[PDB]
Write an enzyme that holds these catalytic residues in place. Structure first.
Site, PDB file in Angstrom:
ATOM      1  N   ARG A 161      -8.544  -9.838  21.776  1.00  0.00           N
ATOM      2  CA  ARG A 161      -7.078  -9.847  21.840  1.00  0.00           C
ATOM      3  C   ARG A 161      -6.508  -9.764  23.279  1.00  0.00           C
ATOM      4  NH1 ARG A 161      -3.232  -5.157  19.032  1.00  0.00           N
ATOM      5  NH2 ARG A 161      -1.312  -5.630  20.203  1.00  0.00           N
TER       6      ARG A 161
ATOM      7  N   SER B   2     -19.599  -3.730  39.025  1.00  0.00           N
ATOM      8  CA  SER B   2     -18.659  -4.159  38.002  1.00  0.00           C
ATOM      9  C   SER B   2     -18.524  -5.668  37.969  1.00  0.00           C
ATOM     10  CB  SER B   2     -17.290  -3.542  38.287  1.00  0.00           C
ATOM     11  OG  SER B   2     -16.302  -3.961  37.356  1.00  0.00           O
TER      12      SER B   2
ATOM     13  N   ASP C  38     -20.964  -1.972  34.802  1.00  0.00           N
ATOM     14  CA  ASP C  38     -19.812  -2.082  33.906  1.00  0.00           C
ATOM     15  C   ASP C  38     -19.580  -3.536  33.518  1.00  0.00           C
ATOM     16  OD1 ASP C  38     -17.004  -2.157  33.079  1.00  0.00           O
ATOM     17  OD2 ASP C  38     -16.600  -0.299  34.185  1.00  0.00           O
TER      18      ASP C  38
ATOM     19  N   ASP D 228     -14.552  -6.164  25.304  1.00  0.00           N
ATOM     20  CA  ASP D 228     -13.405  -7.070  25.526  1.00  0.00           C
ATOM     21  C   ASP D 228     -13.795  -8.316  26.363  1.00  0.00           C
ATOM     22  OD1 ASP D 228     -13.616  -5.497  27.802  1.00  0.00           O
ATOM     23  OD2 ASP D 228     -11.545  -4.719  27.744  1.00  0.00           O
TER      24      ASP D 228
ATOM     25  N   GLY E  77       0.984  -1.143  16.993  1.00  0.00           N
ATOM     26  CA  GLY E  77       0.915  -2.227  17.959  1.00  0.00           C
ATOM     27  C   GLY E  77       0.053  -1.957  19.179  1.00  0.00           C
TER      28      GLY E  77
ATOM     29  N   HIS F 216     -10.989   3.841  33.369  1.00  0.00           N
ATOM     30  CA  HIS F 216      -9.822   3.779  34.270  1.00  0.00           C
ATOM     31  C   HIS F 216      -9.229   5.126  34.643  1.00  0.00           C
ATOM     32  CE1 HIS F 216      -9.750  -0.490  33.789  1.00  0.00           C
ATOM     33  NE2 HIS F 216      -9.427  -0.458  32.490  1.00  0.00           N
TER      34      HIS F 216
HETATM   35  C1  LIG Z   1     -10.754   0.952  27.580  1.00  0.00           C
HETATM   36  C2  LIG Z   1     -11.095   0.207  28.858  1.00  0.00           C
HETATM   37  C3  LIG Z   1     -10.224  -1.018  29.129  1.00  0.00           C
HETATM   38  O1  LIG Z   1     -10.550  -1.980  28.153  1.00  0.00           O
HETATM   39  O2  LIG Z   1     -10.618  -1.481  30.403  1.00  0.00           O
HETATM   40  C4  LIG Z   1      -8.723  -0.726  29.125  1.00  0.00           C
HETATM   41  C5  LIG Z   1      -7.814  -1.945  29.315  1.00  0.00           C
HETATM   42  C6  LIG Z   1      -6.404  -1.510  29.715  1.00  0.00           C
HETATM   43  C7  LIG Z   1      -5.390  -2.630  29.894  1.00  0.00           C
HETATM   44  C8  LIG Z   1      -4.063  -2.140  30.473  1.00  0.00           C
HETATM   45  C9  LIG Z   1      -3.008  -3.224  30.695  1.00  0.00           C
HETATM   46  N1  LIG Z   1      -1.852  -2.664  31.376  1.00  0.00           N
HETATM   47  C10 LIG Z   1      -1.052  -3.411  32.145  1.00  0.00           C
HETATM   48  O3  LIG Z   1      -1.259  -4.604  32.353  1.00  0.00           O
HETATM   49  C11 LIG Z   1       0.134  -2.683  32.749  1.00  0.00           C
HETATM   50  C12 LIG Z   1       1.105  -3.403  33.685  1.00  0.00           C
HETATM   51  C13 LIG Z   1       1.524  -3.082  32.292  1.00  0.00           C
HETATM   52  C14 LIG Z   1       2.547  -1.969  32.053  1.00  0.00           C
HETATM   53  C15 LIG Z   1       2.517  -1.476  30.617  1.00  0.00           C
HETATM   54  N2  LIG Z   1       2.739  -2.594  29.645  1.00  0.00           N
HETATM   55  C16 LIG Z   1       2.741  -2.095  28.241  1.00  0.00           C
HETATM   56  C17 LIG Z   1       1.722  -3.679  29.840  1.00  0.00           C
HETATM   57  C18 LIG Z   1       1.728  -4.204  31.269  1.00  0.00           C
HETATM   58  C19 LIG Z   1      -2.576  -3.771  29.368  1.00  0.00           C
HETATM   59  N3  LIG Z   1      -1.781  -3.132  28.471  1.00  0.00           N
HETATM   60  C20 LIG Z   1      -1.671  -3.931  27.369  1.00  0.00           C
HETATM   61  C21 LIG Z   1      -0.848  -3.599  26.197  1.00  0.00           C
HETATM   62  C22 LIG Z   1      -0.519  -4.580  25.259  1.00  0.00           C
HETATM   63  C23 LIG Z   1       0.258  -4.280  24.182  1.00  0.00           C
HETATM   64  C24 LIG Z   1       0.746  -2.970  23.982  1.00  0.00           C
HETATM   65  N4  LIG Z   1       1.507  -2.700  22.873  1.00  0.00           N
HETATM   66  C25 LIG Z   1       1.946  -1.462  22.680  1.00  0.00           C
HETATM   67  C26 LIG Z   1       2.810  -1.229  21.478  1.00  0.00           C
HETATM   68  C27 LIG Z   1       1.649  -0.417  23.572  1.00  0.00           C
HETATM   69  C28 LIG Z   1       0.895  -0.666  24.677  1.00  0.00           C
HETATM   70  C29 LIG Z   1       0.415  -1.969  24.918  1.00  0.00           C
HETATM   71  C30 LIG Z   1      -0.385  -2.319  26.027  1.00  0.00           C
HETATM   72  C31 LIG Z   1      -2.421  -5.044  27.664  1.00  0.00           C
HETATM   73  N5  LIG Z   1      -2.981  -4.939  28.914  1.00  0.00           N
HETATM   74 CA   LIG Z   2     -16.188  -4.376  34.514  1.00  0.00          CA
HETATM   75 ZN   LIG Z   3     -11.353  -3.583  29.213  1.00  0.00          ZN
END
Ligand SMILES: CCC(O)(O)CCCCC[C@H](NC(=O)[C@H]1CC12CCN(C)CC2)c1nc(-c2ccc3nc(C)ccc3c2)c[nH]1
Ligand SMILES: [Ca+2]
Ligand SMILES: [Zn+2]
Ligand SMILES: [Ca+2]
Length: 368
Positions: free
Chosen positions: A264, A191, A168, A258, A21, A135
């Site tokens: 997604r 950015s 970026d 993305d 997931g 990040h």
């Molecule tokens: C590589 C560069 C890049 O593209 O900039 C990285 C993008 C990173 C996005 C991070 C974002 N994190 C957040 O929004 C942080 C406040 C939370 C806490 C943690 N939960 C899981 C989600 C909300 C986030 N986390 C998810 C997400 C969605 C589904 C998930 N599902 C699983 C099973 C585990 C982690 C998961 C995390 C969505 N959005």
């Molecule tokens: Ca950016």
């Molecule tokens: Zn991203």
């Protein structure tokens, strides 16, 4: 004219798994590689396998304690590291997975090796689709990133380049890179990202740097639904003004996919052509360029995007009909390289785009 392109890839990268997931899928790097091999893009590129970056190379930016933790933690011993896991933000977004440290070593190795190749003037462009993990902080993992390969690659470029420009185009703000160089004028960070009720919450128009770095951080905050036309109209004018005022001698471009339509986690509406127009714009300045990956969570579109951007780097035209490949079934029902934008509303009105561009131009007038 046509440039020499060096490409970094380790065949093991696609086997690293964040867990069921989790949106981050290293397998997308292997899909990209297989698609570009089947298009014959290997005939014009020097392909290198990155070395595994050492804990020592990573500590040129990250703290010794944080890197020691990353090198020690495993799913089988996690129970004994609950304290350090909280301290370093290892949890749901940045989980402990088998081979985590090796994944960081390969992602980082590609970026640093590409920077060394550019410093030695042995290539015009270096590509590392496994990098761009923008990040990660000095002593903290964040947003699926553990080691900031970009900051490490920039530190390497700073050995031979007085000024380095970082751009970026990931949908998320490039906070780790901006934070690392916030008080210096030797790196300008630019950015373009979704801003408002969106991770990581930083990248306001008013965040422009501090101390000697004042006016050397540029943020273009956007709303949902930006399309090729709107993005194209601000990217080239902003990058042209930044090139004119800052005069960097090397560029690093984070190509997070993305920002494409149908992602997604993202809510932008770019096509692969609209995203790749950014690469075309930067490439036109004829400066040493390190192209990196980043986000991208609809993996068939990430493979299309980065395959097309590698063809752009090589000045090679490739057909829209996808060649047969190991992941052919992932590209149905159309089996074409290019994607169509959705009917989503572009909340970024033309007046909003021009207003933000004009505010950024006022800040750029403050450079020496
Ligand atoms: C590589 C560069 C890049 O593209 O900039 C990285 C993008 C990173 C996005 C991070 C974002 N994190 C957040 O929004 C942080 C406040 C939370 C806490 C943690 N939960 C899981 C989600 C909300 C986030 N986390 C998810 C997400 C969605 C589904 C998930 N599902 C699983 C099973 C585990 C982690 C998961 C995390 C969505 N959005
Ligand atoms: Ca950016
Ligand atoms: Zn991203
Ligand atoms: Ca800066």
């Amino acid at each position: 004219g046509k440039k020499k392109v060096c490409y970094y890839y380790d065949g093991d990268i696609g086997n690293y798994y964040y867990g069921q997931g989790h949106p981050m899928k290293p397998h997308r790097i292997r899909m990209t590689h297989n698609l570009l091999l089947n298009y014959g893009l290997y005939r014009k590129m020097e392909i290198y396998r990155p070395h595994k970056a050492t804990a020592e190379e990573m500590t040129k930016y990250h703290s010794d304690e944080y890197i020691k933790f990353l090198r020690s933690i495993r799913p089988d011993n996690m129970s004994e590291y609950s304290k350090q896991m909280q301290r370093f933000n290892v949890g749901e977004d940045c989980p402990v997975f088998d081979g985590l440290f090796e994944f960081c070593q390969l992602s980082t190795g590609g970026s640093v090796a590409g920077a060394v190749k550019l410093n030695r003037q042995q290539t015009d462009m270096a590509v590392n689709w496994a990098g761009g993990l923008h990040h990660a902080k000095k002593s903290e993992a964040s947003g699926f990133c553990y080691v900031n390969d970009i900051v490490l690659a920039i530190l390497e470029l700073l050995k031979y380049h007085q000024r380095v420009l970082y751009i970026d185009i990931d949908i998320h703000h490039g906070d780790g890179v901006e934070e690392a160089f916030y008080t210096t004028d030797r790196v300008m960070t630019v950015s373009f990202h979704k801003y408002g009720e969106y991770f990581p919450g930083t990248g306001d128009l008013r965040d422009i740097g501090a101390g000697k770095g004042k006016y050397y951080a540029v943020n273009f905050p956007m709303r949902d639904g930006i399309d090729d036309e709107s993005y194209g109209q601000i990217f080239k004018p902003i990058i042209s003004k930044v090139m004119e005022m800052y005069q960097p001698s090397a560029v690093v471009l984070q190509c997070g996919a993305d920002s494409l339509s149908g992602d997604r986690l993202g809510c932008f509406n770019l096509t692969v052509k609209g995203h790749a127009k950014c690469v075309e714009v930067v490439k036109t300045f004829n400066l040493p360029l390190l192209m990196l990956g980043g986000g991208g969570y609809t993996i068939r579109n990430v493979a299309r995007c980065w395959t097309y951007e590698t063809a752009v780097a090589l000045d090679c035209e490739i057909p829209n009909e996808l060649p047969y490949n190991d992941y052919f079934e992932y590209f149905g029902p159309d089996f074409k390289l290019h994607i169509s934008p959705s009917n989503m509303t572009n909340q970024n009105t033309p007046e909003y785009m021009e207003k933000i561009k004009q505010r950024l131009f006022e800040n750029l007038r403050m450079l020496p």
